[PDB]
């Protein structure tokens, strides 16, 4: 809930992070928008 | 002449309450701007 220069696993970007309610399956690391741009991520240190 | 007019305004009201396609002149002008923007967002997925 602040704007940040985030980087997960080398997927660098800029944005405000938030608690999602998407259910990524165990094999999925990233969720994508209609523009092939990442709009959700699972954190690699806590699996939320 | 008043009864025919009042009845014809009644037929307009019921016709507009019944068919969808008559306003297609306006709905198509909304659909074309929406489709043009959906296409412009999709092009952010092209590798070029
Ligand atoms: C010119 O056209 C008029 C129709 O737009 C027409 O009016 C219609 O006249 C008939 C009787 O001749 C009416 O028929 C109904 O009459 C009563 C109910 O009011 C019922 O008992 C009958 O069963 C029947 O349903 C129409 O209601 C009436 N329509 C309107 C809008 O008034 C004129 O008679 C025509 N004039 C001439 C000079 O031909
Ligand atoms: C990462 O660190 C925490 C705190 O030390 C630890 O509890 C957790 O097990 C670690 N994460 C993984 C994926 O093991």
From Swiss-Prot, chain A:
Source superkingdom: Viruses
* Biological role: Attaches the virion to the cell membrane by interacting with host receptor, initiating the infection. The major receptor is host ACE2. When S2/S2' has been cleaved, binding to the receptor triggers direct fusion at the cell membrane. When S2/S2' has not been cleaved, binding to the receptor results in internalization of the virus by endocytosis using host TFRC and GRM2 and leading to fusion of the virion membrane with the host endosomal membrane. Alternatively, may use NRP1/NRP2 and integrin as entry receptors.
Oligomer status and interactors:
Binds to host ACE2. RBD also interacts with the N-linked glycan on 'Asn-90' of ACE2. Cleavage of S generates a polybasic C-terminal sequence on S1 that binds to host Neuropilin-1 (NRP1) and Neuropilin-2 (NRP2) receptors. Interacts with host integrin alpha-5/beta-1 (ITGA5:ITGB1) and with ACE2 in complex with integrin alpha-5/beta-1 (ITGA5:ITGB1). May interact via cytoplasmic c-terminus with M protein. May interact (via N-terminus) with host bilirubin and biliverdin, thereby preventing antibody binding to the SARS-CoV-2 spike NTD via an allosteric mechanism.
- What's the protein called, per UniProt? Spike protein S1
Question: Which stretch of the intact protein is present?
Answer: 536 to 583 of 1273
């Amino acid at each position: 809930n602040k704007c940040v220069n985030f980087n997960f696993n080398g997927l660098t970007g800029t944005g405000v992070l938030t608690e999602s309610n998407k259910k990524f399956l165990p094999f999925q690391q990233f969720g994508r928008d209609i523009a092939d741009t990442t709009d959700a991520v699972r954190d690699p240190q806590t699996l939320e | 002449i008043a009864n025919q007019f009042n009845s014809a305004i009644g037929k307009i009201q019921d016709s507009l309450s019944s068919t969808a396609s008559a306003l297609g002149k306006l709905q198509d002008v909304v659909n074309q701007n929406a489709q043009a923007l959906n296409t412009l967002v999709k092009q952010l997925s092209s590798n070029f």
